[PDB]
Amino acid sequence: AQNPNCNIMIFHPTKEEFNDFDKYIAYMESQGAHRAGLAKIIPPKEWKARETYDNISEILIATPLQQVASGRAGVFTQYHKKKKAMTVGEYRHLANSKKYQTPPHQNFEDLERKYWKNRIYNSPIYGADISGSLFDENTKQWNLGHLGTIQDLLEKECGVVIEGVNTPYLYFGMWKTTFAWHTEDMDLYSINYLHLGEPKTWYVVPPEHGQRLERLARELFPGSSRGCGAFLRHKVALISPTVLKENGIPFNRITQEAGEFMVTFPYGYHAGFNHGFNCAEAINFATPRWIDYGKMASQCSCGEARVTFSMDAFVRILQPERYDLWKRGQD
Ligand SMILES: O=C(O)CNC(=O)C(=O)O
Ligand code: NI
Ligand SMILES: [Zn+2]
């Protein structure tokens, strides 16, 4: 078996290899990449997402989110407080202000130490889940707005025709902005391109060990666990690498820099944080190997994990026994 220790693999496709997206995902998996839950893909030197980012300040962040933490430094939840709308230009200025800017630091490791020591004492503001794309329409390779759709994948694999669309989302981050431990909706893949700015550090649990993380989460957030059997779908819980190590949870970490793609694989739990002002684009996607994961994905029915209407068809077709209960949670 390839990659038995479930290490995060890094790929350097040639421009020829970068033509066929599906084929390269399958190639990465043939090398065991999926066992980590996360892979990095560095595009060939000839590739670019767009000409410049010189004209993006007028994008609107309609609902910036202030991420307010509760708990202890290594075990906390965060809730999102809605703030007034601001442009990306205004957001960038805010990110770079004395209140929110990245502190002096020696290297990525020093900054990581500072993040886990001090995150809970600040409330950074995130621009998340903004529908849109920053890929040039003429970018033909790994353009996250031009991928084959999950609906078409399901149709190709299972013969079912369903409603729904899936399009990319933009994320504007600043120092300490945080993404909580989660897998994707329906345990889909995700792909994330860091367009511009400071890095993003990722933590990931191998899919074959995801239930170990779930069991620890239930112990660490006991009230949340009683409220919902799948409460990590609420995307509010953080657990530090120190606490993961203390509890023997297998995981890996890696830092993504501007110009790099990350792919998360079905049922690969991940979390992380931004180093400073940046902009990422991400979208969910599927492959034939995903279908089994979609069938088995655990659902939140408590009402906290409201999702896109695109997910209705996924649950309806792949999980008909769970559909009624889940739909009650969505309404
Ligand atoms: O970048 C972020 O804030 C969160 N991204 C993801 O969880 C992802 O790409 O799957
Ligand atoms: Ni994700
Ligand atoms: Zn729930």
Side-chain angles (χ1 to χ4, degrees), residues 1-81 83-305 307-327 329-330:
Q2 299 276 35
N3 193 18
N5 281 2
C6 300
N7 297 311
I8 299 169
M9 301 178 67
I10 303 165
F11 294 89
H12 290 82
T14 63
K15 56 189 194 304
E16 293 76 22
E17 288 166 347
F18 218 49
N19 286 323
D20 191 328
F21 184 83
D22 284 352
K23 182 177 179 177
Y24 202 77
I25 300 300
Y27 168 75
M28 285 191 293
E29 294 188 348
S30 79
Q31 303 303 292
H34 56 295
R35 296 196 62 177
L38 182 70
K40 176 181 289 195
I41 306 92
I42 293 166
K45 61 190 187 295
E46 299 86 1
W47 181 91
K48 60 188 163 188
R50 68 182 294 116
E51 304 283 330
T52 80
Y53 292 87
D54 287 337
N55 305 117
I56 49 82
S57 306
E58 312 300 309
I59 292 173
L60 189 67
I61 306 172
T63 313
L65 303 174
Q66 183 173 35
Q67 301 186 298
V68 182
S70 302
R72 61 176 171 106
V75 181
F76 62 91
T77 57
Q78 59 186 10
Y79 82 90
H80 292 166
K81 179 174 182 176
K83 311 294 287 195
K84 288 167 142 252
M86 69 182 84
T87 67
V88 164
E90 294 169 331
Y91 179 86
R92 181 179 58 222
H93 187 80
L94 184 65
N96 294 333
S97 69
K98 293 182 184 179
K99 182 174 181 67
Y100 292 104
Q101 68 179 218
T102 315
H105 59 280
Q106 292 293 343
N107 49 39
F108 290 171
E109 177 175 322
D110 188 31
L111 197 64
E112 180 186 36
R113 182 191 60 79
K114 292 174 180 290
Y115 172 85
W116 288 108
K117 186 182 179 185
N118 299 312
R119 158 69 183 93
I120 61 169
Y121 301 111
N122 299 84
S123 298
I125 297 162
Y126 210 0
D129 302 324
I130 298 165
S131 290
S133 183
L134 282 172
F135 286 90
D136 189 313
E137 69 177 2
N138 297 316
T139 298
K140 298 313 172 183
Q141 300 171 320
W142 286 54
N143 183 324
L144 299 191
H146 293 172
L147 303 182
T149 69
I150 301 161
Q151 292 80 16
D152 282 341
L153 184 280
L154 269 166
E155 182 183 330
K156 284 187 295 194
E157 292 301 297
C158 304
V160 303
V161 178
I162 54 169
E163 77 285 356
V165 297
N166 291 92
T167 56
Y169 300 90
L170 300 180
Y171 301 82
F172 294 92
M174 67 170 58
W175 167 234
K176 279 174 177 170
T177 58
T178 302
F179 52 109
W181 281 107
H182 70 284
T183 61
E184 303 304 307
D185 293 338
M186 220 64 185
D187 296 343
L188 283 155
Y189 298 70
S190 67
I191 179 163
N192 182 300
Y193 182 69
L194 190 51
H195 279 283
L196 177 81
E198 303 315 306
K200 192 187 299 278
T201 291
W202 300 67
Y203 304 92
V204 60
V205 174
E208 66 200 66
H209 301 302
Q211 290 185 322
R212 295 187 187 218
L213 181 69
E214 293 171 355
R215 289 195 295 274
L216 175 64
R218 293 193 180 103
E219 297 167 342
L220 292 180
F221 306 94
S224 296
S225 184
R226 284 188 290 274
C228 181
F231 77 94
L232 290 176
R233 299 244 180 241
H234 305 172
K235 299 199 288 184
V236 298
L238 277 304
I239 306 163
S240 74
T242 298
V243 172
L244 292 180
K245 282 203 178 310
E246 287 174 338
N247 288 277
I249 310 301
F251 74 97
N252 282 296
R253 74 192 86 192
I254 192 167
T255 295
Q256 174 194 22
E257 298 188 71
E260 304 180 337
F261 290 91
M262 306 298 298
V263 165
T264 83
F265 294 88
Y267 195 59
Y269 275 102
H270 52 285
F273 66 90
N274 294 306
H275 290 205
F277 172 71
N278 61 19
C279 172
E281 178 169 343
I283 195 176
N284 294 121
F285 70 94
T287 70
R289 198 180 62 86
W290 164 74
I291 297 288
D292 289 333
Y293 289 86
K295 291 175 178 170
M296 297 184 299
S298 303
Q299 304 299 350
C300 163
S301 302
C302 81
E304 286 303 306
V307 301
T308 178
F309 185 73
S310 189
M311 208 179 125
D312 194 276
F314 302 161
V315 180
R316 195 170 76 245
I317 296 305
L318 296 182
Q319 306 180 314
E321 187 268 330
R322 291 183 176 168
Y323 181 62
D324 276 23
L325 180 62
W326 173 81
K327 187 124 196 181
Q330 297 287 298

